[PDB]
Amino acid sequence: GKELVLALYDYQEKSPREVTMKKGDILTLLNSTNKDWWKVEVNDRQGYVPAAYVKKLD
Question: Could you tell me the residue range of the domain that residue 5 belongs to?
Answer without folding.
Answer: 1-58
